[PDB]
Amino acid sequence: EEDLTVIIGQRVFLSLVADLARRMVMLIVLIDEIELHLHPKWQQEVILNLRSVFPNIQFIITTHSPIVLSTIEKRCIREFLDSPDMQTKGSENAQILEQVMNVHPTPPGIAESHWLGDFELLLLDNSGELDNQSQELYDKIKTHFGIDSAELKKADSLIRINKMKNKINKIR
Amino acid sequence: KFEEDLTVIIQRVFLSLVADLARRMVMIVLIDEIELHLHPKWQQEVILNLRSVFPNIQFIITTHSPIVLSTIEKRCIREFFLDSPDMQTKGSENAQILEQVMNVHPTPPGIAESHWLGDFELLLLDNSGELDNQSQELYDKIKTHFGIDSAELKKADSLIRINKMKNKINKIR
Amino acid sequence: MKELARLESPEILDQYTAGQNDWMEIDQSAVWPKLTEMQGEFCAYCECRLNRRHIEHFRPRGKFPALTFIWSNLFGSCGDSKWSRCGIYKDNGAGAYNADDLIKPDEENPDDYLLFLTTGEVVPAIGLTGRALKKAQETIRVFNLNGDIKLLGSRRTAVQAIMPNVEYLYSLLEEFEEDDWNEMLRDELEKIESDEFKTALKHAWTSNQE
Ligand SMILES: [Zn+2]
């Protein structure tokens, strides 16, 4: 590109910025793994502090972290070299992970991750009623995650939308 | 205060570490930054591969990513009087082990293009619910900056319909 | 924030009078059975689920001697002193919150000065100006409702997990009749009373009565 090129395959940033500034004042940058040793909170504000403190310089970075990609435009992403099909500037770090990095949001290995999706499958396998098997899985969702978690507030919204769908269909 | 099996305190390198550990053992393990030079689809299968090879060896791994946390139970987390979180990380999505365990929003806060959607609602709730010129120039900028497939446009077009029917029933009154 | 309704006062707050007495010598176990009846099992300021509960004085006990054993001034906040939200933050945190420029849940409908977008953000209501706009901008700042990542993150999930459910009810509106659809909406607004962020969902369901 012309300004940034991320090719996907604060203390730590200090030395880097200081050395770059010293070299610039005394007078392209290959910045590998700009997400190294950075908390996910400083990863959201690393490329914004390099296009501000270093306005006129070309940057080529190497990255495998969804957060620092969420601060870059899609024009600069050159994945191993055609850019992805989604805009990764302001998109959730969970949709830049599934669609640009082919990583499912929840782990595949953990058998407790295929419980909400399996719950949807079971609930839509009975025409929207919690008969006897989806009820057991819903009980295991509450007992494991919590009384109010993201995996139970989503499971309880399915038992309600399905109930409404059944009620409306019975009227139609 | 540590657990018995896991204590997480919030490919070549990993293979070399595993080989060295195996060679030392055959002849506790406190890994630092387990998610070092690991693609996301090698972080959600690293904690489960560190125990399968080594059945009984206490681990004091320290991490910064919200993905290797989703393969660990809540009781094993140790924030920094270190205190465990209040959500079950095991099996949780890698966008709520980040927000509610690491205090990092899903969408960037500093990018003016992420607020757009949450701002487009305001221009719709100010004009009674229907669209206007100042709001349609922010819907187009969402349909030209996020492409016509994405969730951002699928949420902006869900607000439009919901607030066009929420103003329809309100109008009938 | 909901519109809490203070009906009666605990009898325990009648043998204790400000001055000679101190808040510590009050058996808080005799106050909670009344607070839980007023605000339910949710925080007064953020409507989270009270799990780590404590009793907060709307006007603090240091800047307002007296009013410390007055029922009108006692609310239930979501942070015990063994936090970065309402209650604990109202004292340790925000540095200037003159009590007049704050929404009292039990005396001022906190729906005229607050709007909960479907993205979980609490922005001042629409069209407010003058002093009424300062009340919203101050209650959203002293009771963090937009600046805590664990709360703004817990209300986006609760308000967006039912967004698909809202879009369907309104979708089946021009095909249904007024009475049946209104009954279904009521049934949907009669179940959030016992759910977290009862007002964030209610704003995503019908409106802030606008
Ligand atoms: Zn609260």
CB-CB neighbors (< 8 A) of A102 in chain B:
41
* CA–CA separation, A167 and A127 (whole Å): 11
Per DSSP, which regions of A33-104 are E strands? 59-63
Name which of B91, B109, B113 is nearest A89 (Cβ-Cβ): B113
CA–CA distance, C21 with C2 (Å, rounded to integer)? 32
Neighbours of A38 (CB within 10 A): 21
Contact A112, B92 (CB under 8 A): no
CB neighbour class for A154 (10 Å; exposed up to 12, middle 13-18, buried from 19): buried
Indicate the residue of B86, B158, B168 with minimum beta-carbon distance to C167: B158
CB spacing of C119 vs B121 below 8 angstroms:
yes
Taking Cα atoms as reference points, which of A105, C120, C48, A96 lies closest to residue B92?
A105
Chains touching A (at least 3 CB pairs under 8 A) are B, C
The number of C-alpha atoms within 13 Å of B114 and in the hemisphere containing its C-beta is 19
Q: Under a CB-based contact definition with an 8 Å cutoff, are residues C172 and B119 in contact?
A: no
Of A40, A87, A94, the CB nearest to B147: A87
Q: How far is the CA of C88 from the centre of ligand 1 (A)?
A: 9
Q: How many residues does chain A have?
A: 172
Q: What DSSP line would sit under chain A, residue for residue?
A: --SEEEEE--HHHHHHHHHHHHHHHH--EEEE-TTTT--TTTGGGSSTTHHHHS-S--EEEEE--HHHHTBS-GGGB-B--B--SS--BS--TTHHHHHSS---SS-SS-TTTTTHHHHHHHHHTTTS---SHHHHHHHHHHHHT-TTSHHHHHHHHHHHHHHHHHHHHHH-
Q: What is the resolution of this structure in A?
A: 3.4
Distance between CA A63 and CA B45 in Å, rounded?
19
Give the C-alpha separation, A152 to A145, whole Å.
Answer: 7
Give CA–CA dist A101/A91, Å, rounded. 14
Q: Is residue C1 part of a domain?
A: no
Interface residue ranges in chain C relative to chain A, Cβ cutoff 8 Å: 49, 157-158, 161-162, 164-165, 168-169, 172, 176, 180, 184, 188, 191, 196
Residues of B with CB below 8 A from C127's CB? 126
For helices C178-189 and A150-171, angle between their N-to-C axes, nearest 10 degrees: 160
In a domain, C3, yes or no: no
- Residue labelled with tokens 């009781």: B75
CA distance C142 to B128: 29
Length of chain C: 210
CA C152 to chain A, closest CA, distance in angstroms equals: 13
Are the CB atoms for A38 and A62 separated by under 8 Å? no
Q: Is residue C123 part of a domain?
A: yes
In a domain, C190, yes or no: yes
Distances A29 to A4, A54, B7, C130 between C-alpha atoms, Å: 10, 11, 38, 51
Residues ending a continuous segment of chain A before a break (C–N > 2.5 Å): 9, 27, 80
Report CB contact under 8 Å: B105, C117.
Answer: no
CB C132 within 8 A of CB C100: no
- Looking at the domain assignment, is residue C210 inside a domain? no
> What does the alpha-carbon distance between residue C29 and residue C18 come to, in Å, rounded to a whole number?
19
C→B interface, C-beta within 8 Å: 51, 115, 117-119, 121, 123, 126-127, 149-150, 152-154, 157, 163, 166-167, 170-171, 173-174, 178, 206-207, 210
Note whether B50 and B77 are within 8 A (CB).
Answer: no
**Coil vs helix vs strand at B41:** helix
Q: Measured between alpha carbons, how far is C151 from C160 in angstroms, rounded to an integer? A: 14
Which SS3 state, helix, strand or coil, does residue A31 take?
A: strand
Distance CA C60, CA C39 (A): 20
Q: Look at C150 and B100 and tell me if their CB atoms are within 8 Å.
A: yes
Selection from A59, C166, C146 nearest residue B165 by Cα:
C166
Ramachandran class of C144: left when φ > 0, alpha when ψ lies in -120 to 50, beta otherwise: beta
How far does the CA of residue C177 sit from the closest CA of chain A (Å)? 12
Give me C46's structure tokens.
């953020």
Nearest CA in chain A to C159: A153
> Which structure tokens are listed for C39?
């605000």
Is C121's CB within 8 Å of B118's CB? yes
Domain membership of residue C124 (yes or no) is yes
What SS3 state is found at A25? helix
Residue A43 contacts residue A68 (beta carbons within 8 Å): yes
CA-to-CA distance for A4 and B123, rounded, in angstroms?
Answer: 33
Contact: A157, C165; criterion CB under 8 Å: yes
User: In chain B, what is the straight-line distance between the N-terminal and C-terminal CA atoms, in Å?
Assistant: 62
B162 and C149 within 8 Å at the Cβ level: the answer is no
Query: Is C173 close to B117, i.e. CB distance below 8 A?
Result: no
B132 min Cα distance to partner chain A (Å):
24
Instruction: Report the C-alpha gap between A64 and A87 in whole angstroms.
Output: 16
Helix (H, G, I), strand (E, B) or coil at A111: coil
- C86 Cα–ligand 1 center, Å: 5
Chain mean position to CA C192: 14
- Closest by Cα among A40, A98, A5 to B41: A98
Closest CA–CA distance from residue B30 to any residue of chain A (Å): 17
DSSP 8-state class, residue A122: H
Q: Provide the domain count of chain C.
A: 1
CB B121 within 8 A of CB B160: no
Instruction: Answer whether C166 sits within 8 Å of B162, measured CB to CB.
Output: yes
Rounded CA-CA distance B12/C184 in Å is 58
Q: Which residue type occupies A56?
A: N
Residue A35 β-bridge partners: none
For strands A4-8 and A59-63, give the pairing.
Answer: parallel
* Residues counted in chain B: 173
Helix (H) or strand (E) holding B9: strand B8-9
Angle, helices B151-171/B133-145, rounded to nearest 10 degrees: 150
* Of C122, C53, C74, C64, the residue nearest C98 (C-alpha): C64
Cβ B71–A112 below 8 Å, yes or no?
no
Structure tokens at C182: 């209104």
Domain of C130 in residue numbering reads as 11-205
Give a yes or no: residue C4 inside a domain: no
Instruction: State the smallest CA–CA distance between residue A26 and chain B in angstroms.
Output: 31
- According to DSSP, residue A118 is labeled H
C-alpha span between B47 and B69 (Å, rounded): 9
CB contact under 8 A, B165 and C178: no
- Dihedral of alpha carbons B41, B44, B45, B46, sign: positive
Q: Do the domain assignments include residue C143?
A: yes
% helix, strand, coil for chain C, step of 5: 40, 5, 55
